[PDB]
Design a protein around this ligand. Structure first.
Ligand SMILES: O=S(=O)(O)OC[C@H]1O[C@@](COS(=O)(=O)O)(O[C@H]2O[C@H](COS(=O)(=O)O)[C@@H](OS(=O)(=O)O)[C@H](OS(=O)(=O)O)[C@H]2OS(=O)(=O)O)[C@@H](OS(=O)(=O)O)[C@@H]1OS(=O)(=O)O
Ligand SMILES: [Cl-]
Ligand SMILES: [Cl-]
Length: 187
C-alpha cells in the first residue's frame, strides 16, 4: 500500500521557500523534496544559505537542515590567529590566552554550538597567590616562581634535620580563592 508519508518540516533556524504554495500538500509522499533556506547566522549542511530537504522513510533529511555559523572574535588578552574566521556547528577551536589569562574555566578550546560559542571566546584574568606572602622557617620555597595560579602548588623543602607535618623532609601548599592552603611547617 503506502510507505507513507512525511509532515510539514518544522525547520529550526530556517524555513521552506514558497511556503504558501506547498502548504497544504502535506502530509507529503516519500521522495518529495523541497527547497529551504536558513536564517542569518545559520547555514545548510552544504555550507550555503539554501538547500533541499528530502522526505525519507525515516523522516526529513537532513535531520538538522540549518547549522549555526560561528564567527571568531578578537581576543584582547590572548593570541589571535582566527579573528574573522567562520566555523560550522560542532567545530572545536584551540584558544591561546596570554600568560596569566585563561578561558572560563578553564577549557583550552571553544566549540560552536547551535546557540553560539561554548564557552564564550574570551580570556579572563586568573586569580593568583603570591610567593611573597608565603612564610616558612627552617625551610625554603624550592620552586621558585613569584605568582601561582589558583589550584597551583608551591613547593617547599625543609632544612637538614627538619621535617614537615606529614612528616616528610619536603612538602607543598596550594593556592586557593582565599589564599594559600596553609603555612609550610618545618620542625
Ligand atoms: O566578539 S564580540 O562580542 O565582540 O562580537 C564580535 C562580532 O561582532 C560583529 C557582529 O557580531 S554579531 O552581532 O553577533 O553578528 O560585529 C561587531 O564586532 C566587529 C569587530 O569584530 S571585533 O572582533 O570586535 O573587532 C565590529 O566591527 S568594527 O567595529 O570592529 O570594525 C562591528 O561594528 S560594525 O557593526 O561592524 O559597525 C561590531 O558590531 S556590533 O557593535 O558588535 O554590533 C562581528 O563582526 S562582523 O561580522 O564584521 O559584523 C564579530 O564577529 S567577527 O567574527 O569578529 O567579525
Ligand atoms: Cl580575551
Ligand atoms: Cl624561608
Amino acid at each position: 500500500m503506502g510507505l507513507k508519508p512525511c509532515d510539514y518540516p518544522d525547520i529550526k533556524h530556517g524555513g521552506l521557500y514558497h511556503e504558501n504554495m506547498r502548504r497544504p500538500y502535506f502530509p507529503v509522499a516519500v521522495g518529495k523534496y523541497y527547497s529551504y533556506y536558513c536564517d542569518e547566522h545559520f547555514e545548510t549542511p552544504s555550507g550555503s544559505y539554501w538547500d533541499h530537504i528530502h522526505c525519507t522513510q525515516d523522516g526529513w533529511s537532513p535531520a538538522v537542515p540549518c547549522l549555526r555559523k560561528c564567527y571568531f572574535p578578537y581576543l584582547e588578552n590572548g593570541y589571535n590567529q582566527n579573528h574573522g574566521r567562520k566555523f560550522v556547528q560542532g567545530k572545536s577551536i584551540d584558544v591561546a590566552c596570554h600568560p596569566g589569562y585563561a578561558l572560563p574555566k578553564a577549557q583550552t578550546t571553544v566549540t560552536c554550538m547551535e546557540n553560539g560559542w561554548s564557552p564564550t571566546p574570551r580570556c579572563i584574568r586568573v586569580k593568583t597567590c603570591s610567593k611573597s606572602s608565603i612564610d616558612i622557617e627552617n625551610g625554603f620555597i624550592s620552586e621558585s616562581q613569584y605568582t601561582y595560579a589558583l589550584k597551583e602548588k608551591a613547593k617547599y623543602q625543609c632544612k637538614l634535620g627538619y621535617v614537615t607535618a606529614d612528616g616528610e623532609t619536603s612538602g607543598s601548599i596550594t593556592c586557593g580563592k582565599d589564599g594559600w592552603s596553609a603555612q609550610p611547617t618545618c620542625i
